[PDB]
Structures are given as C-alpha cells and as structure tokens.
Enzyme design. Structure first.
Site, short mmCIF file in Angstrom:
data_model
loop_
_atom_site.label_atom_id
_atom_site.label_comp_id
_atom_site.label_asym_id
_atom_site.label_seq_id
_atom_site.Cartn_x
_atom_site.Cartn_y
_atom_site.Cartn_z
N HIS A 53 53.38 75.03 0.63
CA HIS A 53 52.27 75.38 -0.25
C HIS A 53 51.38 74.15 -0.39
O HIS A 53 51.89 73.03 -0.40
CB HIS A 53 52.73 75.71 -1.68
CG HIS A 53 53.70 76.85 -1.77
ND1 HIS A 53 55.04 76.69 -1.55
CD2 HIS A 53 53.53 78.16 -2.08
CE1 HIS A 53 55.65 77.87 -1.67
NE2 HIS A 53 54.76 78.78 -2.00
N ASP A 56 52.80 71.62 -2.71
CA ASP A 56 54.00 70.90 -2.29
C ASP A 56 53.65 69.62 -1.56
O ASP A 56 54.42 68.66 -1.57
CB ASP A 56 54.81 71.72 -1.28
CG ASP A 56 55.35 73.03 -1.82
OD1 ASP A 56 55.64 73.12 -3.04
OD2 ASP A 56 55.50 73.97 -1.00
N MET A 87 53.23 77.50 9.67
CA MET A 87 52.81 78.36 8.57
C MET A 87 52.50 77.51 7.36
O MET A 87 53.15 76.50 7.12
CB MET A 87 53.92 79.40 8.28
CG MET A 87 53.63 80.38 7.14
SD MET A 87 53.95 79.77 5.46
CE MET A 87 55.70 80.18 5.27
N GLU A 180 53.49 88.71 1.73
CA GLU A 180 54.90 88.70 1.38
C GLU A 180 55.17 89.59 0.18
O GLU A 180 54.82 89.21 -0.95
CB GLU A 180 55.36 87.28 1.09
CG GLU A 180 56.82 87.15 0.76
CD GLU A 180 57.30 85.74 0.75
OE1 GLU A 180 56.54 84.87 1.23
OE2 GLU A 180 58.43 85.49 0.27
N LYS A 182 57.32 91.43 -2.89
CA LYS A 182 58.47 91.20 -3.77
C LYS A 182 58.38 92.24 -4.87
O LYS A 182 57.28 92.50 -5.35
CB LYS A 182 58.44 89.80 -4.39
CG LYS A 182 59.75 89.40 -5.04
CD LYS A 182 59.70 88.04 -5.76
CE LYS A 182 61.05 87.68 -6.38
NZ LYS A 182 61.04 86.50 -7.26
N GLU A 216 60.84 89.06 3.18
CA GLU A 216 61.92 88.16 2.81
C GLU A 216 63.19 88.97 2.55
O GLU A 216 63.17 89.92 1.76
CB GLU A 216 61.57 87.34 1.57
CG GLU A 216 62.72 86.46 1.12
CD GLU A 216 62.38 85.51 -0.02
OE1 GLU A 216 61.34 84.84 0.05
OE2 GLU A 216 63.20 85.43 -0.97
N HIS A 219 64.07 89.73 -1.07
CA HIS A 219 63.11 90.51 -1.85
C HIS A 219 63.28 92.00 -1.64
O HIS A 219 63.25 92.78 -2.60
CB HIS A 219 61.69 90.06 -1.55
CG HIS A 219 61.43 88.65 -1.97
ND1 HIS A 219 60.22 88.03 -1.75
CD2 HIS A 219 62.21 87.75 -2.61
CE1 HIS A 219 60.28 86.79 -2.22
NE2 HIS A 219 61.48 86.59 -2.75
N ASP A 244 60.90 85.54 6.30
CA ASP A 244 61.65 84.62 5.43
C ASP A 244 63.12 85.05 5.40
O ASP A 244 63.44 86.17 4.99
CB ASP A 244 61.11 84.62 4.00
CG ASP A 244 59.88 83.76 3.76
OD1 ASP A 244 59.34 83.16 4.66
OD2 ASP A 244 59.47 83.74 2.56
N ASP A 254 65.94 86.78 -7.96
CA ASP A 254 65.81 86.27 -6.59
C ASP A 254 66.69 85.03 -6.43
O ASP A 254 66.40 83.97 -6.98
CB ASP A 254 64.32 85.95 -6.45
CG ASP A 254 63.87 85.49 -5.08
OD1 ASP A 254 64.37 85.97 -4.05
OD2 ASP A 254 62.86 84.73 -5.03
N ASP A 256 67.81 83.48 -3.42
CA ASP A 256 67.45 82.53 -2.37
C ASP A 256 68.69 81.78 -1.86
O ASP A 256 68.66 80.57 -1.62
CB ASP A 256 66.33 81.58 -2.81
CG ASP A 256 64.93 82.21 -2.76
OD1 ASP A 256 64.74 83.45 -2.60
OD2 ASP A 256 63.98 81.40 -2.91
N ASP A 286 63.49 80.62 3.57
CA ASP A 286 62.98 80.46 2.20
C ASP A 286 64.21 80.58 1.31
O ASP A 286 64.61 81.68 0.94
CB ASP A 286 61.92 81.48 1.84
CG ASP A 286 61.35 81.25 0.45
OD1 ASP A 286 61.74 80.26 -0.19
OD2 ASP A 286 60.50 82.05 0.01
#
Ligand SMILES: [Mg+2]
Ligand SMILES: [Mg+2]
Ligand SMILES: [Mg+2]
Ligand SMILES: [Mg+2]
Ligand SMILES: [Mn+2]
Ligand SMILES: [Mn+2]
Ligand SMILES: [Mn+2]
Ligand SMILES: [Mn+2]
Ligand SMILES: [Mn+2]
Ligand SMILES: [Mn+2]
Ligand SMILES: [Mn+2]
Ligand SMILES: [Mn+2]
Ligand code: NA
Ligand code: NA
Ligand code: NA
Ligand code: NA
Ligand code: NA
Ligand code: NA
Ligand code: NA
Ligand code: NA
Lengths: 387, 387, 387, 387
Positions: A53, A56, A87, A180, A182, A216, A219, A244, A254, A256, A286
């Site tokens: 992102h 980040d 990406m 994406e 969710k 994902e 998700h 993902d 979630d 992960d 992810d």
C-alpha cells in the site's frame, strides 16, 4: 525439499511480515520493520517479489523529499536482491478520514480525496513496474440500514473505477485493476462482498476489460463459500488477475493465517485448479504471522506459506498424473461433463426421443457416481498414503 | 388491520403451504394438499396468486390424459377465485435421476433430459399466463473437489440457459428467466451460490436481457450476507425479476420460516428498499409452515407472511415520511452520497487543490456521521415507539 | 497399507451405510439394506462392530414375534462375523409423534411414551452387550421463542434422565448413558447445543456418574467450534464415554461426510488427542455415504472412514515421537503449561516479588512463542513432507 | 417516553462509551475520555452505574500516588452523580505480555503475574462496592493445535480460579466471580467458548458457589447459538450472576452493537426471559458506539441501549399479560411442559398402559402445536400491531 524458485512467483505484501500485531484487543507485539529489511529477508527465503500500500512504503503525510528518499531506499533493496513489485494498492481504510469509506463515503469531499490518493499511487506503481493495481474497499459499507443507500453507493463506486480507467488510458499505462471482495470486517457489511458480486459489478464498468478480481482465500471463507469454486468462476470469466493466498478457519474474523493453515483440503483443490488452469500471475500471500511470534517466527511463517504451496503442488500433480485417478475420473464421468450437452442444436434436442420419451430415468438413476472412491484417491495423494 | 389486497401481489408456491413436513430426520406430519384446496384457501386469506413446479401440479410420470385433468382442475380453481399464476419452475432436484444435477450433471443424457423436462413446463407456464420462469439449481454442485470441474460445469450451465433462451425466442414467448442462487444444501456447495455469482453468470449468456435473479431471503443469509444489500445490487443491475420472501436465523440449513421471522430488521430494510425502489413484481413467499403445525397452523403461518410484510411497509413508509428522519438523513449526508463525485470530470478533479493539497483531512475526519441517531429513529419507527 | 484390526474398535451405525439417501429435497437413491448384509459387509472391511436405533433393527410397530425374528437374524449375523454391539440408542425423532420432542415435548403423554420406548430398548441393548446407551435429542427445541420454556424443558429433560438412571440402577445394569449435543437441525435450535451445555447439564442429574457425552465432529463444527478442544474438555471432566466421527464443512446443515473429509487438520488433532489420552472407547462413525453413490460407493466411503483414521494415527504418532518436535514443544513451553502455576500456595504467591514488583513484563513480552515453527512441523508430519 | 430509572439498574463499562475506535484496520477516530466525564454523561442519560477494567481506571504502570489520584477523582464523580460500581474486571488481554494468555499462558511466570494483577484489582473492586468480579479470558486459547494442550490449560485455569476463591474467602469478601465465555477473537479459538462450557467448568472448581457466568449477547451469537436459550440454562443452574447486553449480526467478528441492534427478536425474547425470571442483577451494556460517530453519537448510542431495553420490556409484558396470548400458550401446551412427566414415579410409569400399549401415537401425532399463531401474537406485540 520444497525449495522456492523464481518461476514460482511467490510474493508478499509489506504489511504481512511487517504486521506489528495490533488486534481489536491488544497492542503491538513486534517493532515496525523497515521495508528494506523485509525485502532482503523475503529474498533470502526464495520469494520473487513484494507488494505495498502507498502508506506502507511512504509514511502518510510525508513531504516530497521524504517520499523520494523512502522510494530510493526501497528501490536499492529491490536492485540488491532481484525482487520485483508486481502489484500495488492504496490504503483507503486506516486513516480516520476514511471511516465511512473512500470511493463510497457519504461525504463527497472524501470521495474526491480518495481518488486523488489512489491516482498518485498508480503513478508510483507504474514507476516500480507493477502490472496490477488492487483495490480492497474495506471501509465501503455500513453497520446500519439507513446509513448507506447501496444503489447510490454502487453508482459512486462505478464512477470512481470509471475515472481510474480513464486515467490509466489517458496516460498510456498497461496496468490493470483487481477488485478484492470481502463480506464484512471492518464494516458490518462490505459492498461487493464476494467474488460473484465483484465480477457482476465489473461488467457494468465503462471499460470492463481493465478490471478483474483479486480474491482472497479467507475472505470467501468468511461467507462459508467454496474458494476453489469461486476461483473457477473467475477463471471462467477471464478475470483472475491476481490472488491473495492465506488460511482461515471458517466463519470468523479475518484470520490471515499462513497459506495451508485453515482449510487444508481447500488449499489442495485451489492449487490443483491454479496449476491445471495455467494461472500465470503472482502467488501472493496476504497473511499475518500471529502476534505470539517474534521475528524468527515471522520468517518461519512466511517460509511455511511457500512450502505448503509447493507440497500441495506436488501432490495435486501426482493425483492428476496417476493412471488410477484418470480411470476414476472417467468412472465418475468428468470427461462427459466437459462435452457439450447439445452441439446438435435445439431442434435436434427437441426431436430426440432418447432425451425424453425413451429416456430410462430409473436406469440412469441407478448409476452410481463413484465420487467417494475418487475423493479417497485424492485424500491418499494429498497425504502421501497411496497403497 | 393489515389486510392484504390484490395490488399487494402476494403469491405462494404450491409447495409452501403444501409442504407435508418431511425433513432430514422425520416423516411427513401432514397429508398432501390438493392444489385446488390451496388455491381456494390462499384466496380466502387475500393472496393474489400461486406458483408451481411442474411436479407439484402434475405427478411425475403422469399420462397425457392425467396431465390434462390435473391442469383443468387447477385452472377451474384459479377461475373460481381470481388467483393468478405469475411464475412457474421445474423440479430438477427431487427425482434420483437428478442426484448429480440437471443442467450440470456429469452424465450428458441427464443434462439433455433436464432440458426437455424444463421446456415442456415452459410451454405450460406460458399457457397459464406466467411472466417469469424460475430456475433453482439445487443439485448443481458437489460434496468433493474432484467430482465437479466448475469451469466445465459453468460451460454446461451457460449452454443450457442459452438453449432455453433460443427456445423462448423461437416460440415468440414473452416469459423471462430468473435464476435463484443458494450457497449449499442439498449439495455440499451449490454452483452460483449468491446473488452476485448469478448476476455475473448472466452477463455471459448469449441473450442477457432474458435473464435476471430470483433471490431468496434465507439463501443469502445462509452465507451470512446482507439480503437488502444484495437486492440493491440486483436492482442496480436491472435484474430483480422476482423475489422469494421468508425468514432465516443465520448460517444454518434452509429454514424457510414465514416472512418477518428470522432477521426482523433485515425484513424491515428489505421492505423499505422494495417499496422505495418501486419494485413491481410479485411478493412471493417461499416458506414452510413448521412440521409442528396442523392445517390451521399452515394457514396462520401463510397469513402471517402477508401481515408482516404489510406492517413493515407501514413502518418503513412512516420512517421515510417523517420530517425528523429526513433531517437525520441530511445530517448523515445521504443526500451527498446520491450526488456525483466528479461530474466536473477527471481533468478538473486532478486540477482541484481542494481534493488533495488543500484538503483538511483532520477536519473531515472529525465530522461525525450521526448514523446511530438515524438508526434509533429507524428502530423507533419499526417498533411504533416514536416519543 | 492402513488395514483395520479388531483392536482399532471401529464401529458404524446401521443407519450410516444403510442411509437410503432421502434429503430435504430429494427421494431415496438406494434401496434399504437388511441389517444382516450391513453386518457382513462391514466385517469384511475390518470393522469391529455396529450400533443401532431401536427402529433400525425392529420396524416401528412390529409385533412381539416380528421383533424376536429381527433380533434373531441380527444376532446370527453378529455370531457369523464376530461383530460386536457396543452402543445402542432410541429413535425419538423420526415418527410424527415426536415432532415437538420426546423427553421435552410440551405434551406430557408424549414424554411418558418416549420414556417407555427408551426403556424397552435399554433392555435390548443390554441383551446385545452394549456398554453405552446414546441419547441424541434431535427434536428437543424450538423454531420460535414462545413455543418452549427452556427452564421447564430442562426440568423435564433432567426428570427423564433421572428416571432412566433409576431404571438401570434398579435392574443392576452396567450400561451408562452418553448425551449427544447438536446445535440445530431438525429444530431451529436444539436444547443442549454443544459439548459444554451437555457437560453442565449432567452435573445436575441425581446420579451424574452414570452420564457422559457422545460428541460428534460435525455437530460442534455446526457452531463453528473447535472439536478437539471440546473433546479435551470432555476428557478433562472424565466424560468422554463414546464419540461420533465424521466430517463437516463448517457452518451448514449436518453433512455427515466420511471421517477425514471436511476439516482435515481438525481430524489430525482429534486423532492425536484420542491416542495421546488413551481413549479406550469405540471409534464410531456416524456418517452418510452421499446419495450420489451406489452400494460400491457406500462400502468405499465406509472403508475410507477407517483408512483416514489410521493414516492420521500414524502421522500424529510420528509427530509426537520426532525429537525435533519434542524440542519445538519445549521451545514453545508446552512443558511449562503442564506444571502448576502456584504449588507453593496462595500466600507464597502473594509474597513473591518475582510475580509482581520485580516481574519484567517487557522482557517477558519480547519472548516469541515459536508456535509457527511447531505448527509447520505438524503440517509436514501430516503431509509426510519432512525434509 | 421510555425514560430510564434507578431501579432499571442500567450500567456501562468505561471502555464502551470510552472506546476510541481503533479496529483491526483503522486508527482511533475519537479522543480518550476521562472516566469522570463518562460517569457524569452516563448519569445524565439515566444510567445507574459503571464498570471498569483495572487499566481503564488506572493507566498501566502507574505509581502508587498516580493510582490514588485516579481513584480519588473517579470516586468524586460517583459521589457527585449517585452512580454505582457493581462490577469490575481485570485487563488480561491488551498488554503484549498476555499474548498467549493470562491464567493459561504457557509461561508460568506470566500466569503468576496475571494472578497478582487480578488480586490487586479485586481489592479495589471491593473498595468501590462491586458485588461481581468478571473474568473474560480473551487470550486463553490458540491459533494452532500444538500450541496449547487444552487439558493442561484447563488444569491451569482451574488452579487460577481456585486461588482467587481462596483469596476472597481468606479476606472475608462477599464478591463473587462471573466467567465470560467467547468462542473466538482475538485467539483463533478461545477456551470456555460458550455459556455451556463455562457452566461445566465451574462445577469442577473447589468452591463452585463462588462462580457464575457473565454471558454476552454477541458472543453466543458468534457461535450461531440462541442467546435466550443459553441464559435460560444459566438461570436453571442458578449461575446468572451478571450479563452483558449488546447486538450482533450473526457469525462475524465481535461487533458490540448497541443493545436492540443485531438480532431484534432475540433481544425481545431475552428481555421477556430476564423480566419473567426476576433477574435482579445489573442490565450491563458491553457495546461500542461505531467509529463513524462523534461524541454526540456516542451518547445517542448509549441512550439507545437503554431505550431499546425499555421498549422491549413493555412489549414483552404486554404479550404475557394479554388474555389471548395466555389462551394461545395453553393451546400450545406450555402449561403441560411445566408439569412433571412422572411424579407418580418409575414403577407407576412402567405399569401405565396409557404410556405404551394403549398410547394412540397417530392421534397424538395429529394434534397441531399451534406455535405459528402464538409466534404471530408475539410478533404483533413486539411491533405494536395488535388488531
Ligand atoms: Mg478440460
Ligand atoms: Mg435517490
Ligand atoms: Mg501431560
Ligand atoms: Mg413456570
Ligand atoms: Mn484477509
Ligand atoms: Mn488481501
Ligand atoms: Mn429456501
Ligand atoms: Mn426459493
Ligand atoms: Mn450429524
Ligand atoms: Mn451422531
Ligand atoms: Mn463482545
Ligand atoms: Mn463483555
Ligand atoms: Na446515485
Ligand atoms: Na483469468
Ligand atoms: Na467444457
Ligand atoms: Na430490477
Ligand atoms: Na418445570
Ligand atoms: Na473420559
Ligand atoms: Na496439567
Ligand atoms: Na441465576
């Protein structure tokens, strides 16, 4: 054994191994990582690349000179390691300004700002060589029914994505978008909650060819859905632009988890599908090393993502190559499923007594599908227990 | 109070009030109803019409003379009551021949038979005046990963729906199709599991204008999804051709409770949406009086479906008409959500310093949404507790 | 490889392999099996024994002479094969009389009949050598809030189980009871919905030592719970009298997949726990071969239940025996978890400055748990991918 | 209308209205509140009292002089308003030291510290007049199967609660403990995941009379369970020492919506049960004003919690007082459910031909339960739509 290679195309978000461990109930358990250290450590594990992102890589609110220095250091790390950036994406969820959404915030000024923040980062993504620009609209949605008119919000979401498509077209960029889905979290319900809803939305954009999905694992599983089935529909539509990979234990927040954790058999069928279909995109993780872990556990968890993909790839390939499995697939009529129902055409079907008056329904109904034998061959292959 | 009228367009499947009460663990608790008695009893309650699967009206395997007599008796009951038949559908799930599917059975002979069975009933539906032909593919799917190649199955599902579209076009029929999603049950996972997946699939049919969705309250809730949100997306796409109304308590087996039971606030927001959007189709109930009930309880449960719709309609209308609610909607910027983000166009947005360099993110983030006050006005209106 | 043996104690309900395939939407796909054929076929696969509901062995309503002949034929099959009958149970759910419950029906006459039906079958169970008498109260519960006063229903449920305990005590029988929880289905909500609720209820019975639990993998997973954790609590309480093994994909209708299907990693941790704890009871399968299958698929699915248990047993044993895993368990402080917190006693704990004033919370918080490395060793062992 | 009064006993955690809005994906949206301001604002709304974790009232790591000043200011606010403190609890979840648990951390030094932190706060709770000390073990559990031996963890959890019971007994305190179950979040699975598991655990403590449950609406609903049913079992056991009221939309992350939001009909049946049973404890709200809200929305959301309880109380009382409902309850045999099955005793039941040989099962099975009419009377009363 099960050593990652560049052709595997394993990638990780900076925010994955860099997750400091703050959760709804708990403070950070790990210090922040410099993106340079994550790039170098991931390269040492055999990763192909990273993703980011905007916020980040460049602290929110950075000056132009600060932005340049952060990017310069990151590019040196990429150059030092051979890591790629396939990406990138925008953070339209952390800052309080986005509490009711970015592209679908009720406040118009916020929607405009969200677009400008995204556009700035698309330029950077292109500079770094990214082929895909992801959008996870985690703040698009509601906790209450009156707060969000969903038809109006879909109008605003279409307007935003159409403007982004106009932007990349006008700049001659080759990047494409991946939405994406969710179902919920952090909003009570999120707009475009599944692969299906996102695929349907894309068909109504002005330039649909520029947009696909970034599904994902966890998700779709937060809605109790079959992730391999949803990936199959995305592939069928020509829209699996990115993916993902992670793990999830069913209908929860979630999690992960590292890939292979959570629903292991769904992970097997996913890898089987991606490999059989020839998916050529990044195998992007992810995920979040649990906050119980120190940095050694962070890198162990990241290595485990790749290892599990490679084990599953081996087992799925062995399943498909086994002459006994091929025989079982024919016994279960998977070959017939792949043949047209009525290539002879509608009139021939209507005229065919074997399809109606002379169809022996009881004889047909007596035929077993032999699906259990097939599935136990699949189990034996997954577990390495053939014999 | 809360008396149904013809303009309400309340309809019921023959299989709803006619459900004999057999469940995965239990024998029937009620005798079979003659469709004639259901038509007359529903008319007495103020229903507008009924719907049917082929095999609800004509016992499977009936001779041509038996078929004619069953239809004749049914039409006399419709004529005696003024009841309409706005929708019909095919039973492609009960008979053992359909154990692996109808349109997506692995066996090609079964796929062909499923099409012929459907086509025969489309002709009957048109004869009875139906505007919509529903398809709920309850057997399309799998319990195991190797049993069903989903890309091939989607090819077969598209082929089948394309052939049906060719058929109705060739006969000059005005009927349209409505695909009913469900995530699971009776198959471990069902193909096209949500409104989104069905909407996306339709876009790939050869004549997409002939197909819409028939969403069911409880089916979307079996994936934990927001049913009003999914209906909004269907409306946004122009695809809400029909709807199935009932109740469900979350992520369970398909309960088919009477409408208003289950998630009551979702029922309120659904009615608000249908009425605000001007949905003009049938308000169809796909529900099951619990097997605890005798016939008096069957008719009480059916009456309750309609009563609850009418109560919710009154309360939602009062909510939307209340000047205090209208003020709260403006306080929460629902008006702004409905206005374009950037009707000034992309270049103007890029040039607008108020959207980036001069956007005061902290001032924007400080603004409360006032969603809780709005939602408590909604609660007060639902409960008739304003004051 | 992975051949069942008598010491494995694998058992099956007559109703499992004998399930004819009727589901909420579909007719039977297989003919009824004679219990004699199931006993002989299961023995050929290496099963140890079978279990039964009264009405699986003796058709409901049979005369005394019919009852005797059915039992005689069954006992001959057991004698011919060496198969045992370690458990029996009552069908208090299929017949319409039980539509609101057996022991907790609102109608008192039904509650009394349910007890008499159970008592008759306890006598038969003892005659056949059963050590455990299961009770799954599938009809105890409600679809609506006013229908069932749960405090009164728990009073009736306690009264019933207390009477059954008085009965077996009075007859000098050694059999014990095992209550099987389920959260929902066929009732909207079932009383005693989880292992925990059943364990708590047992503590309030007059003779608690006579009652334990019969947890079923898929039932706890229908509430999204961790089945190994619940089994651990039952073991901790000394109450794991029997177990039902199968598979389930999360929060859905009760799928009764073969054991190992569904949540494979939960199956691994379950087997690890049962074997490590020395569980000595039957490894009983309460599963349903999918209705897609013919009889060859029935027997394949049953064989797969046992095979998967044996594979998982091998892998869990290898995990626990691996010196690298033992080292990882110590690195993660599993040894410390097993040591008392304060065997020195309360006053010593209160006086211990190392537990408060001199406890270095930041140094403690810096220690990683190393759980991810441990879990990847577990994954590698499950998959046979060590190296 | 619907004005709170002191006898209503409505209480709120400091952490509820004081939640700053940080979520798994987002920064705080509201500044921290001084507990003094929350006490005064809640009093103005008609609340009875507040509750606290240690670290809500006294910043973690405070010196003795800082601790005294924080408590002094808080007590002045309580004295200025008449607010009470009926319950307190320990924060054993936020600080990184508790990442693997407090009482069941694998590290023994952490378990000892967790006990000392709790004991210090029990003393403070008693000083402030609290009758109940809650324990929500949000960090007790695991993300992976090898990380936590659940039998050992239950041994440690019992040891901890036994030591706390020894402590309060030794000090002559009248306070009692209330264990708060939750199924998951922040751990992948939490130990004691439901009301049932907690009730069962309590029965194995050395002084079981000192411990009850603190069930939370949304936590049981995160397992898809019926919250009123679980409260009924707690009441039946004599263990409902406290309750947490809020709303939840099914199987998701813990939403902590205001009470009445989420499952509205479950909220109705809950209030009906608490009032009918004469529950005398606090009506405590453990909720979070959504992070979309400013402080005006915080106070609106808190006011809504109390308002919704009072509306539901009125409607449930009207339901129970309505002679038509009383007639419907008798028609559905709720009176019979409350009468013993066999007060005549086991031998009389065994000798009673009306319970077996002469029981007309088909006549019994023909009787309808009339549950749908009863439930529609309940719906009409909830909605204020009688007529
Ligand atoms: Mg192919
Ligand atoms: Mg509008
Ligand atoms: Mg030990
Ligand atoms: Mg009473
Ligand atoms: Mn995620
Ligand atoms: Mn993602
Ligand atoms: Mn349904
Ligand atoms: Mn339907
Ligand atoms: Mn089951
Ligand atoms: Mn069972
Ligand atoms: Mn909560
Ligand atoms: Mn709470
Ligand atoms: Na609009
Ligand atoms: Na694709
Ligand atoms: Na194909
Ligand atoms: Na429409
Ligand atoms: Na009672
Ligand atoms: Na035990
Ligand atoms: Na121990
Ligand atoms: Na109590």
């Amino acid at each position: 054994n099960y050593a990652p290679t560049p052709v595997d195309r394993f990638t990780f978000g900076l925010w994955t191994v860099g997750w400091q461990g703050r959760d709804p109930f708990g403070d950070a358990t790990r210090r922040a990582l410099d993106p340079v250290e994550s790039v170098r450590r991931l390269a040492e594990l055999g990763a192909h690349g990273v993703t980011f992102h905007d916020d980040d890589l460049i602290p929110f609110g950075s000056s132009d000179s600060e932005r340049e220095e952060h990017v310069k250091r990151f590019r040196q790390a990429l150059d030092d390691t051979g890591m790629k950036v396939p990406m990138a994406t925008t953070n339209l969820f952390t800052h309080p300004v986005f509490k009711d959404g970015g592209f679908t915030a009720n406040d118009r000024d916020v929607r405009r700002y969200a677009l400008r923040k995204t556009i700035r980062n698309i330029d950077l993504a292109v500079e770094l060589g990214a082929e895909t620009y992801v959008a996870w609209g985690g703040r698009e949605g509601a906790e209450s029914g009156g707060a969000k008119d969903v038809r109006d919000a879909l109008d605003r979401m279409k307007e935003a994505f159409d403007l982004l498509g106009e932007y990349v077209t006008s700049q001659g960029y080759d990047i494409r978008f991946a939405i994406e889905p969710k179902p919920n979290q952090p909003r009570g319900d999120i707009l475009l909650p599944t692969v299906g809803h996102a695929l349907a939305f894309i068909e109504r954009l002005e330039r649909p060819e520029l947009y696909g999905v970034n599904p994902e694992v966890g998700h779709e599983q937060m809605a109790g859905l079959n992730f391999p089935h949803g990936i199959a529909q995305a592939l069928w539509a020509g829209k699996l632009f990115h993916i993902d990979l992670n793990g999830q234990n069913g209908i929860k927040y979630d999690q992960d988890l590292r890939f292979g954790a959570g629903d292991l058999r769904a992970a097997f069928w996913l890898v089987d599908l991606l490999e059989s279909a020839g998916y050529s995109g990044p195998r992007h993780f992810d995920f979040k090393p649990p906050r119980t872990e120190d940095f050694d556990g962070v890198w162990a968890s990241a290595a485990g993502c790749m290892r599990n993909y490679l084990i599953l790839k081996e087992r799925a390939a062995a399943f498909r190559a086994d002459p006994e499995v091929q025989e079982a697939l024919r016994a279960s009529r998977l070959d017939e499923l792949a043949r047209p129902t009525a290539a002879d055409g509608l009139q021939a079907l209507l005229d065919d007594r074997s399809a109606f008056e002379e169809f022996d329904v009881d004889a047909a109904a007596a035929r077993g599908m032999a699906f259990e034998r097939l599935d136990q061959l699949a189990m034996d292959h997954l577990l390495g227990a053939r014999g």
